[PDB]
Amino acid sequence: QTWSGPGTTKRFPETVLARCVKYTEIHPEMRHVDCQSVWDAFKGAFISKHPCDITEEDYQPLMKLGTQTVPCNKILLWSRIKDLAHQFTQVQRDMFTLEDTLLGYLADDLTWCGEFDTSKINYQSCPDWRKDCSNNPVSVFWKTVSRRFAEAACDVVHVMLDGSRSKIFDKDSTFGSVEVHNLQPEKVQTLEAWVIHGRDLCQDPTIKELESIISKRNIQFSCKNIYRPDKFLQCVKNPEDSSC
Ligand SMILES: Nc1nc2c(=O)[nH]cnc2n1CCCCOP(=O)(O)OP(=O)(O)OC[C@H]1O[C@H](O)[C@H](O)[C@@H]1O
């Protein structure tokens, strides 16, 4: 095998297309997206390209077709706690993660790459970010869309963090390396962290580091513990409870 990472997800083309159809069927704003054109732009970003030479520019046509206004004050970022974040926005349809946007939805949990100077999709292997190269089709996609998603944020932006991790805030994560640095100080008043337990984890040294970084960008920092994730989701679903 050429690469260290898993290959393209089985029936990736069909999957992307069907996810686009489903998304544009559900969301009114996207009711006039051409899903064939979306797929054309998507594969055009990586097909026939060396999968270690992908650029942010390669994804521009896809970004254009997938342009979407998201309510800027309703953004939930997350790091290393994907499941709860998505369960949260499933209940509180008010709030959006990146994976609730058209492009994030299309790509979530999928792997893809092409081969240099041929039209084939590589279903055998693809570059691993760490072992092979960082400018691969998947990593460059997420870097670009997550930057744009962070730039769209305003007002109070929330981030869900995993408090069972050794690094609750990890500066090397997508959240720490891309999103925190692309929030716009002109628009974003506060970054509020929700530290999810499995103790005042808002006093953890990495949260303090996050606090310092954000403050120095002239954005306010707030932090809250979520001691009981189950009860959290319970109250998100049934919030009028006295118990909430
Ligand atoms: N969002 C996302 N989905 C996938 C996927 O399905 N496959 C490969 N990558 C994926 N990404 C980007 C990488 C997220 C995985 O966690 P990571 O590399 O340690 O960096 P994290 O802080 O955990 O990233 C999650 C944050 O960035 C994303 O924009 C998301 O909106 C969240 O705010």
Curated annotation (Swiss-Prot):
Would you kindly state one Gene Ontology biological process term found in this protein's UniProt entry?
Answer: B cell proliferation
Which cysteines form disulfides? 20-35, 52-133, 113-126, 202-223, 235-244
Please indicate if the UniProt record lists Nucleus as a keyword.
Answer: no
Ways its activity is controlled: ATP inhibits the cADPR hydrolyzing activity.
Task: Give any Gene Ontology cellular component.
Answer: cell surface
User: Chief subcellular site?
Assistant: other
Which EC numbers characterise this protein's activity in its record?
Answer: 3.2.2.-, 3.2.2.6, 2.4.99.20
The way this protein sits in the membrane is described as: Single-pass type II membrane protein
Substituting residue 93 to W results in: Seems to contribute to the development of type II diabetes; 50% reduction in activity
| Comment on pH dependence | Optimum pH for NAADP(+) production is 5.0 from either substrate, activity is much higher at pH 5.0 than 7.4.
List the active site. Answer: 72, 154
Q: In which tissues is it expressed?
A: Expressed at high levels in pancreas, liver, kidney, brain, testis, ovary, placenta, malignant lymphoma and neuroblastoma.
Instruction: Indicate which residues are glycosylated according to the record.
Output: 53, 117, 162, 172
Q: Could you tell me the superkingdom of the organism this chain comes from?
A: Eukaryota
Write out the catalysed reaction: 2'-phospho-cyclic ADP-ribose + nicotinate = nicotinate-adenine dinucleotide phosphate; NAD(+) = cyclic ADP-beta-D-ribose + nicotinamide + H(+); NAD(+) + H2O = ADP-D-ribose + nicotinamide + H(+); cyclic ADP-beta-D-ribose + H2O = ADP-D-ribose
Compartments, record wording: Cell surface; Membrane
Q: Which residues lie on this side of the membrane: Extracellular?
A: 3-244
Alphabetized, the UniProt keywords read: Diabetes mellitus, Disulfide bond, Glycoprotein, Hydrolase, Membrane, NAD, NADP, Receptor, Signal-anchor, Transferase, Transmembrane, Transmembrane helix
**Which Gene Ontology molecular-function terms are recorded?**
identical protein binding; NAD+ nucleosidase activity, cyclic ADP-ribose generating; phosphorus-oxygen lyase activity; transferase activity
What does the subunit comment say? Homodimer.
Q: Which family does it belong to?
A: Belongs to the ADP-ribosyl cyclase family.
General function of this protein: Synthesizes cyclic ADP-ribose (cADPR), a second messenger for glucose-induced insulin secretion. Synthesizes the Ca(2+) mobilizer nicotinate-adenine dinucleotide phosphate, NAADP(+), from 2'-phospho-cADPR and nicotinic acid, as well as from NADP(+) and nicotinic acid. At both pH 5.0 and pH 7.4 preferentially transforms 2'-phospho-cADPR into NAADP(+), while preferentially cleaving NADP(+) to cADPR and ADPRP rather than into NADDP(+). Has cADPR hydrolase activity.
Please share what else the UniProt entry notes about this protein: A cell surface antigen recognized in lymophocytes by multiple mAbs.
Name used for this protein in its record: ADP-ribosyl cyclase/cyclic ADP-ribose hydrolase 1
Species source reads Homo sapiens
